Structure formats: structure tokens, C-alpha cells
Symmetry: C11
Subunit: 68 residues, 11 copies
């Protein structure tokens, strides 16, 4: 099952898990300080992940960068 890597490029990056299912809203927000890395899967409860704030992101389709 797929995962994304998120490296925070500043304090307070917000990695937001959206609920899997007929309804969509966020069910968890994990904040990262600058330099921290989160490696997070798609799961039974999370089917979309949003990143807010400056982050360096890797997925199976390559590198992408969120800007705050």
C-alpha cells in the first residue's frame, strides 16, 4: 500500500488526513517542526492527504514541494 514522505521546511507544517468513505472531512492533523519527516500511508481511514506549509514531498510519482 502507497505512502508519501513529507519533510517540513519550516515550523508548523500541517499534514492533514481526509476520511475515506462517502463523506469527506479531515480526521487528523499531524504538525511537523522544521526538519522533521513524516512517512504516511494511505489506509482504511485515510484516502487523501493534504499538506499545508513549506514541505518537500516524495511520492511514487516523484518530488513535489508545498509552499505556505
Amino acid at each position: 500500500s502507497d505512502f508519501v514522505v513529507i519533510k517540513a521546511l519550516e515550523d508548523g507544517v500541517n499534514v492533514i488526513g481526509l476520511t475515506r468513505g462517502a463523506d469527506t472531512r479531515f480526521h487528523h492533523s499531524e504538525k511537523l517542526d522544521k526538519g522533521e519527516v513524516l512517512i504516511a500511508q494511505f489506509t482504511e481511514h485515510t484516502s487523501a492527504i493534504k499538506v499545508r506549509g513549506k514541505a518537500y514531498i516524495q511520492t511514487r510519482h516523484g518530488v513535489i514541494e508545498s509552499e505556505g
Copy 2:
């Protein structure tokens, strides 16, 4: 299951999930502001995804760019 990456290139971008099944309609519109990235799967409930607004998009088939009205 496959996923698409969408990075908003201006405020107010909408990533719209279309319902899976005989019926086709919008069930959710996720609004993205400039700089934010959404990584969204295809799912039991979403079998097509529409992007309105300027965005940089990656899928397994490569990069594509939506342009806003």
C-alpha cells in the same frame, strides 16, 4: 489503488470527486489555495476526479497542468 498529486498554483483551485456507480455527480469539492498539495486516491466512492483552476498535476502517466477560466 492509484492516486493523483495536485498542487494549487493560485487560490481557489477545486479538486472535485465524481461518484462511482451508474450515477455520475460531484460528491465533494476540495478547495485548495496557492501552494497547497492534495494527494488523492481513487476509491470505492470516487472513480473520476476533475480539477478546476491553475494546478500542477502528477499521475502515474506523468505531469499535466490544469489552467483556470
Copy 3:
């Protein structure tokens, strides 16, 4: 399950689902205006997809372009 990416290159492009099953008829026509992108799977309900109007198309077999 695979999908196809369609970017509309002018207004009023139609992405048409054809029904899976013994019967083949339309079922849904999604209208894309210029610059809009639709990323659409093959599904239990849709086993063929037609594009009408000018669009840039990506599939697992590469790029192709429809013309209006």
C-alpha cells in the same frame, strides 16, 4: 484499475462513458471547458470512453490528441 487523463484544449469538450455490459450506450457526458482536466477510471459501469472536441489525452500507452 486504469485511468485516462483528459485536458480540454477548447470549450465544450465531452468525455463520454459507454456502459459496461451486453448493451453499449452513452450513460454520462462530462463537459470540460478549456483548461479543465478530468482523470477518469474504467469502472464497473464504464468499459469504454469517448472523447469529442479538442483535448490532450494521456493513458498508460502514451499521449494522444482528439480533434473537434
Copy 4:
């Protein structure tokens, strides 16, 4: 399942599905006008596909061109 991409290079191209099963006959003929694109799977009902008319075709095996 595998799918084929067909781009009509002239009007009145026919993409014809042959029935899966002990019997082989045409169950459906999809007419494409010049410039239209049909992306069509193999399915429970369709185990062979015939293209009549000038078209550009992609399959997992690469490009091939049908001629009028």
C-alpha cells in the same frame, strides 16, 4: 483488463466488438468521426475488437494503423 486506444483519422471509422464465448459475432459497432478518440477495454462481453477505416491505434504492444 487491457484496453486499446483508437483515434479516427477520417469520418465513419468503425470500432466493432466481437462477442466473448463459444459463438463469435459482432455485438456492437461504434462509429467515430474524424478526430474522435475511443478508449475501449476487453470485457466480459468483448474478447476481440476489429477496426475498419483509417485510424491510429495504440495497444500495450505499441502503435499500429488501420487503413480505409
Copy 5:
């Protein structure tokens, strides 16, 4: 399931399905005229295919040409 692509390079090319099972015989022969393409799967009923007549053939193993 695998498929073979056949482009007829002359009229009257025959793409012949051989029966799956203990018995081997021809259950169907599809006639292609010049420039027609047939894309044909292996199936529950067809476990070998024979092409007779001049054609350009693609499979997973590459290109081969039959001659009349």
C-alpha cells in the same frame, strides 16, 4: 489475459481460433480485408490462434509477419 494484434496486408486474411480443451479444431475464422485490424484475446474458448494470408502481427514477443 494476452492478446495478439493482426493488420491485414492484403484481402481475405483469415484469423482462425482453435478450441481450448482436449479437442483441437477451428471454431471460428475471421476474415480481414486489406488494412483492417483485429485485436484478439486468448480466452476460455480460444487457446491457440492461426493467421493465414499476408499480415503484420504484434504480440508481447514483438513483431512477426505471416505470408500468403
Copy 6:
């Protein structure tokens, strides 16, 4: 399931199927004349394939030629 492509390079080529199972014998021989192509899977009934006569063969492991 995998397949073999055989192109006959002369008349009279035989593509022979061998029975799956505890016992091994020929259950079918398909005759190919010059230029005809057969594409043949391994199956419930055929676990080995013999080619006799001159033909160009392709498999997943590349090209080989019978004489």
C-alpha cells in the same frame, strides 16, 4: 498463461502438443504451411510443445529457429 509464436519457413511444419499430467504423449499436431503463423498457449491439456520442420519461433526467452 504463456504462449509461443511459430512461423513456418517451409511447407509441412508440425506444431505438436504434449499432454499435461502423469503421462506424456502427443494429443494434437497442427500442420503449418509456408508463411502461416500459429500462436499457441500452454494450457490445461498442453504442458509441452514440440516443433518439427523449419520455423522461426518466439517466446518470452527470445527467438530460436527449428530446422
Copy 7:
């Protein structure tokens, strides 16, 4: 199932497992001192992993580095 490799580049690096399921919380924090290596899977109990502290990280998407505190 996928794994990540983490090599601590200073003392006191934490490799933190987040719970799988509807509830998300830390359920374990593995402390690495400098030069130690942990190779950790995703599991029925861990669906996300956070690294805090200076570390060299390998995943199937390649090399990433966490930067300390």
C-alpha cells in the same frame, strides 16, 4: 509490506510509530543514538512513522534527511 531505513546522525533520534485505524496517536518512540540503524515496517499497528532528530532516511522513494532540533 514497505519499510523505511533510519540511520541516526546524532544522539537521541526518535523513530515514532503512529497508530493505524480511526484513532491516531503515538504508540511507541524508539530512541537511536549516533550511528545506529533501525529498519522499520508499516504494520497492522503502525500506518505512519515520524522521525525527529538528525537522521539519514531511505525509503522506496529514495533518500531523505531529517534535521535536528
Copy 8:
């Protein structure tokens, strides 16, 4: 299941199937005359294959030749 291609480079080559199971013995020898090709799978009944005589052999791991 994997298969092996054996092309006999002299008469009398033997392709020998060894029994699957706790017992190991030869259950069949297929004799190949010069220039014959045999394409043979691993099966419920055959878990090792021995070749005797001069032959050009292909497997998933590349070419090897046997010599008489």
C-alpha cells in the same frame, strides 16, 4: 509456470522429466532429432528437467548449452 526451450544440435538428444514429490525418478524421455525444438514447462508432475546430448537451451536465466 516457467518453461525451458531446448533445441537439439545433434540427433538423439534427450529431454528427461524428473518426478515431483518425495520420490525422484525419471518419468519420461522425449527424444529430439537435430534441429527439433521442444518448449517444456515445469508442472504438477515434473519439478526438474535434465538434458543429455548437444543442445542450445534458453531459460529465464539466459542461454546455456549442453554437450554430448
Copy 9:
């Protein structure tokens, strides 16, 4: 059919520590390696994370990495 890691000890007394799979996380075994020995160790029903202490050359599916003592 799980993944495995290759650990070659570059000095005596390297420890390859298996961590328990499941809700709880603890060391269930430390295999001690002397210099020049190679351990090839899978992830398993009982081991979902592996810690290496001491100097070792390591190979996994994501490449080479080295632990330091």
C-alpha cells in the same frame, strides 16, 4: 515472501536486534555477530522492525547503508 536485510559485521560484537510485531514493541532477541560474519534476516510474524548496533555494512532493497559503533 517478506523482505530481508543483509548485515555483515565489520567488527566483533555487532547486535542485530529483532523488535516485536504487534501492539507492543520490545526487543525479543539480539543476535550477536563477530567480525566478517553475515546474517540475512527476514521480517516475519514476530519481527516487524530490526535495529543494528555496532559497525556493519547493511544491504536492503533500498540500497546500502552502514551502521557505526
Copy 10:
């Protein structure tokens, strides 16, 4: 569907030995190859390790290796 090894005897009296699968490990069969004969042998429900003695050219999915008598 299992993996297999190709063994080409480079001298007479080469032995390809099958070791039993399961809790008990012993030799259950030894196949004698004379010079230039080839054996293509799978791992099986009965054979979970294969030993080659004598001079032979061996191909696995990991590449070529050679045994020396």
C-alpha cells in the same frame, strides 16, 4: 511457480543434492551429472535447499556462479 537453478556439469560425477523442506533437514536425493549434461531443478514442496558438489556452471536469478571440485 517456484524459482529454479540451472546446473551444467563441467566434469564427470557432479552431484546436485536436494535438502528436505521442513523441520528435518537431510539429503533426500543426489542427481549425478556427467560432463556437459544440464539439470534445471526447482525448489519444491520437498526441496528447500540445493547443494552442488564438483565442477559446474550454475545460473540462478542472481546470476552466474561456479562450483569447483
Copy 11:
């Protein structure tokens, strides 16, 4: 299921199978003399393998050498 290739570079190389399960101990040691090769799988009974002595080793992750 994965396997390791071990080529003894001196006499008395010991290939040691460790028990799968909650407990860890060795359940078999297979000694190799110089120039013998052992191709050993991971199995229902062996989930870790230790090599002692000078040996050339291939795994899916490449070559490694043990030193005795």
C-alpha cells in the same frame, strides 16, 4: 520465496538456519567445503541465515562476502 547463494571460499564454511517463530535459535548447520555451492531458501522453518567462514554470497540485494 527468496533464496541466498553461498559459495565456500575455504573448507568448513558453516551455513546456519535460524528458527522462524517467537523463539530464535539455530536448527541446522550445513557445512561446505571449498568450492561447494549451497542455494538455500527462506522457509516455513528458516527465517534468518548466518554464514560463518570465508564465502562469496549472492542475494537479490547483490553480492556480499563473509570473512572467516
